[PDB]
Structure formats: C-alpha cells, structure tokens
Symmetry: D2
Subunit: 211 residues, 4 copies
C-alpha cells in the first residue's frame, strides 16, 4: 500500500516461489532480494537476520514499508485474502485453504525425496500418483464441463490454490519425469495456469534454479 | 449451524487436539468419534474411508451436517474465522496465522524426536529453547504490562494461536520435562490459558493418551 | 581377559536391545546400566558424557575393562565375531551383514512412523509387507537347515542376523500386532528364536518399555 | 577366482561412490554400470530388478561372477576384509567399523539437509562442526602414524574408514565449501587421501554429478 515491497529469500525457488507467482499474477512490482548473489549466501543470510527483526529467524520474509511478515503460508493467505484470490464464500475460502494444505504435504514429500535416501521409487510409484489422483478428483468435482476453457479448483475464479498446485508440479518436473499424462484435468489445469499472460511472462524471464 | 457436528480421528490427541480445544473453549457440542475404540483402529479407519468421501484419505475429518471438511490447519482457521477468534484486523489475522505456522514447525520437530533417532538432546538443548525464545519474544511484543492478568499473542483477545501454543507445550510436556521455567511470559501464558473455565474443565475430563 | 562388562544406555530398548539379546543368548555376564531409572535421564546422560570419553557423544556405549566401544552396529559385529555368531565363511559373514543392514532400514522406518506424521497406514500396508517379503524369501533361500524346528537366515548356525530380525518384529509388535500372519517362515523363525532357553528367560524378565 | 565384477547403480555418486573409491584405490578392474546414462533411469531400474534377483530391491548391487551382493555397508566391509583395508587386529577392525558408522550418521544428515526444509543453517553451524570435531579428535588419538605426510584413522595403514571420511567431506564440499578450515588434522587427512595416485587419477576422471 504505497509502500516499497521487498521479498527476502535465497537465490532459489524453494518456499518463496508461490509468493513470487502471486505477485507475477497480480502484476505487483516488488524487490526480489536473493541471498548468494552479492556474497556467500549464508553470510548474507546471517547479516540479514542481524539487520531485520524476524520472528523465527527464517525466510521468506516479506517487507511492506516497514511492516515485516514471516511464514510463507501466512504470507500467501495474507496476500490472497487482500487481493481477493482466496474464494468468495466462507466455504470456498476453506476449500482453497484445504487444497493448499494438501499441496504442502506432497510438496514436502517431494523435497524429502532423493537418491541417497532410496525413496525415489516410492515417491514416483506410490505417493505422487496417489496425490495426483486426489487433485484430479478435486478438479473434477468443481465441474469443468461448464466452461471447459477454465480450470479452477475453487469457485469460478482463480485462487492461490490454483497457483499452488501448478507450482507443485512445476517444481517436481524440474527433477522428475512428467507424470500428469495420466491425469487429464490436472494436466489441463497446469497448462491453463502456465499460459496465463502474467504467469507465462514471469516463467520465461526467471533464471533456472536448481532449488 | 443447526447441523450435527462430528469429528473423526484416532483415539489420540495428535493433530485433532487443537480442534477439540477450540470446541471446548467455544462451548460447541459435537460427537468426538475415535477409531480404535470399537475395533482395530486401522480396520475402522479403513472402513471410514470407504463410507466417507475424504479428499486426501487423511483424518482429522470434521463433518458439519453433510458437509465434509479435511486438513487440520484449514479446519482450525475455518472454525476460528467463523467464531471470531482469529484477529480483528487484516494484520492481526495474519499474525495469529504466522504464529500458528511457527507452532506447526516446532510441533512437527517434537513429534519427529525419539530415542531411536538419537535426536532428543538436540531437540531439548537446541530446538526447543530457540523456539521458546521466539514465542517469549512475541508475547513480550504484545505488551503484557497493560493488563498483566491477560496474556495474548495477538490483539487484546484470545485467538486460535493462543490455544495452539498452549497445546504445543502441553503435548511436549507429556514426554519431556517442563522447560518453560526459563520463559516467564510463555510460562504465564500457558497457565492462563489452561485455567480458562472451558479449557480447564475439558482437560480434567479427557482421558490420558500416549499420542 | 575376563574384563568387567558394562552397557550404558537409556532405560529403554531402543538401539541397545539387540546387544542385550546377544548377551542373553551367549549367557554373558554384564552390567546393564540405564539412565534415568530414578532421576532425570538427560541430566544423567549429560553427566555420563562429561565423565566418560565417548567418540560421538552417543549411546549405547559398551565398556569392557577400560575399553570404550561406541556405535551400536559396530558393537554388534564386534561381539558377534568374537563369540562366533557371525557366519563361518567370508560369504556367510557377508550375508549376515547384508541382512542386518536390511533390518536397520526397516527398523528405522518403523521408528519414524507415527500418528502425527500420518504415515502409519503407509508403513502398515506398503513398507512392512514389502520388507517382510524380503526376509521371508531370504529365509526360504537358506532352507537346507530350515529343520522342522530350527530356522536360520545364514548357514546352519545362529548369527546376529537371526537376533536382529527377531528384535525387529518384536519391537514392531508392541505397536502393530499380527504383522507376520502371512509370512509363515518369518513367523516360525520368530517363534524359534523367542523360545531359545536363554532368550526366553531374558524376555520373561526384562520390564516393559514403551521405547 | 578372477571373476568379472560389475557394480550397478544410478548415474550418480550417492551411496555407491565409496565402493568406487575402494576399487580405484585397490586398482581393481570392474564394470561401472549406471542407469539412465541415455534413457530413463527409472525404467532401466525397473527392468534391472525384473532381470536380476536382488534381496531388497535396492542398489548398489555388486556382482562378482554369478554372486550378487547388496547393501552398500555390507559390500564395503566385504571388499575391505577381502583386500586388507579393514584393520590388522580385532580392536582395529572394530575402530574402522565404528568410524564408518559415525560417517553414515552425518552423511545421512547432510543428504537430509536442504533449503526447502530450512535446516541448512542448523547443519552448517551445529551438526557439521560437531561431527568434524569428533573426527578431528579421533584422528588426533591415532597420531603415532600421523607421519608428516600420512594420516590414518586406524593403525598405521589405510582402512576403508579413511576413504569413507574423505568421501563424506568430498560430497559435502560440492554444496557447502570450506568446512574443514578449523580442523587441521581432518583437512590434512583429506588432502593426503585425495592425493594418493590411484584416488587422484580416479577423481580427475569421473564426471561431475549433482547427486
């Protein structure tokens, strides 16, 4: 609100990419500060915590004016509620929330998956297909036949849940094969969201990050 | 709303206890259905998923009338927002949310701590004191000197965040020593919340659960 | 020569039970020192580390004379090689080893499973059945000595691998009963081991520990 | 006798690199078979399991002649005992073992650390410094052969324990540089191992793997 917007995080997608996608979709201009660009990523982060008054010594940290906001999920809901992309009814606000909570679950699982731990096949053969099925079924329940051209998990308008699900699979795809092949609506939903003007432009401009 | 309220979960506190505390504090009557009471906990859960249409095949599941709500965090925010215990300003609604997100972090850490994994001393000597410090500092920022008798993390009224922090330490205490000794406000806050009529009565009546 | 043996660990089964089972089987005399029998286990553990020179500040610690041994797996292999329960050939020593490594994987998974984490169903229906099948097949392979009343994983004599598998299911069983119904060889192996006079006498005596 | 040796694993360092380092050190000829060099690594892994009889459906798998060996730790101990790099006494065999067990603990922690999980700072400032100190002290204890240019963790000859510690920091280093600045013995040990002709030649040849 007439205040300089500054997002603080490491030079990576991680837990800040959904926030970035929200700004990109909303056309909100802000300073995307990334650690590890000026100097040692962890030296910068250490000094950051010294200069900024963070509640839990974690990033992302979103600063609006002199207002300091922490916790990625809280930030996402805060921005979504303020910019009306969280549902237009007490029930829909809940559904978008419930879907995001689900996203967090499987997204965490993905980020906890790696060769060293020998849990890659489980994630690929058990966990991902199961959750993809959950999301496929949720998308179907929000009747797509009405206006097929549009794919939304909640109501008839885009919510942060749509961006969260997209970001989930977008992140997974950077490391593992595209499996959406077996989930039509979901596959369609992701294509739809990615091709949105603001989103499509954003993606094309962001640099490739390993994390 | 004029509908029978039914909470479904296992016979344990786990991820459903904050919801139970919310009902207890709000004086809302509901059916507290617990698996493992009528038969094999997992047999019941299996059949439950067959009869109820859950979005992610997880509990807790809160059913209001024929309305099915999943995801503990979403349920907590839904109930809190509806029963006005989530903050009275866009900013305070955010703060209570941010604090709850923090609670989830350390609560997860606690539940991931055990002898077999050899991470007990780290939790007790590093993680818990650090987070207790975060919460102590947050409580202090919400000026307690005003009405010392009252301890709230957000605004001048109770929010679900107050119940979440209480539940966090209440759960930890069941397995590990009371460490709040070094955190006055926090220690005071928990005593205050626990002694609330509805809460105090609830606790005294609930059976002792290992989880 | 005939040094004095002392095992230091918390007052629980955890990672020390396999070592205790080995002693019980071999009929070896030792002092089973447990932290927190009467006081605070962690204050005692803190003092233990200050008084004894441990390599990684972890227990179990086995002291034979003035010799201090650490790392549960290394201790198990040390005792097994010293008291002939490790295999009578290079290949068999390897097989007993390979099996113990497998046990560690699933035993760790079991101890990382809990209600809060919502991974109980996964463990029960995916992970455990899979690993039980691995063990069933390995036992089947070594069936020349599957003698009517004696089952060994390696060769024709008991190895620590046999005690490790027994311990594994013994531990699981105290939380998730009847896991061996569909695995006859494994069930018979468990029965056989649990009925060896020394092991049986030990089990009937040790107290019940939740951990 | 002079069987044909083949190591099967993904096209990455992961849990197979220590075995490869052992072969490199010993100058042993073998086929380093990697999944997904050109195609899909998981389709190839799926086919591998269908074509070869593995005990736990995991890799690495080492085949010598028709002999199939599994479980990385057991394989390392098998090769080390067979090619004399495991210690020349019962006690020293134990010490090399104990050290390797310690390495597994911290190596696993490292591979469980990442931005998404917000546990990087913890690993860097708490865990790694602590474990580096454990190793520094262990190396200091065995300083009768700390000879001007040769450092061994056990006895006066190289053991797999030496290669394991080298591999550990080598892996960490590709993500978190300069971890050995404050640990002179450990740094000197790493330098020494990395400069052995066979090891050096190997390192200069192997390709760069993110995993």
């Amino acid at each position: 609100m007439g205040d300089n917007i500054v997002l603080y995080y490491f030079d990576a997608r991680g837990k800040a990419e959904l926030i970035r996608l929200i700004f990109a979709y909303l056309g909100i201009e802000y300073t995307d500060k990334r650690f590890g660009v000026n100097g040692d990523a962890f030296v910068e982060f250490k000094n950051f915590k010294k200069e900024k008054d963070t509640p839990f010594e974690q990033v992302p940290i979103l600063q609006i004016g002199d207002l300091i906001l922490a916790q990625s999920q809280a930030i996402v809901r805060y921005l979504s509620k303020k910019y009306n992309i969280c549902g237009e009814s007490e029930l829909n606000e809940f559904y978008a929330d419930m879907i995001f909570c689900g996203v967090q679950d499987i997204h965490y699982k993905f980020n906890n998956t790696n060769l060293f731990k020998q849990n890659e096949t489980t994630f690929l053969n058990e966990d991902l297909p199961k959750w993809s099925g959950y999301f496929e079924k949720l998308l179907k329940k929000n009747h797509t036949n009405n206006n097929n051209d549009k794919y939304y998990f909640v109501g008839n308008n885009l919510t942060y849940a749509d961006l969260a699900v997209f970001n989930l699979y977008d992140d997974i795809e950077t490391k593992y094969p595209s499996s959406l092949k077996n989930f039509p609506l979901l596959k369609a939903h992701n294509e739809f969201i990615s091709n949105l003007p603001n989103i499509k432009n954003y993606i094309t401009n962001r640099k490739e990050s390993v994390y």
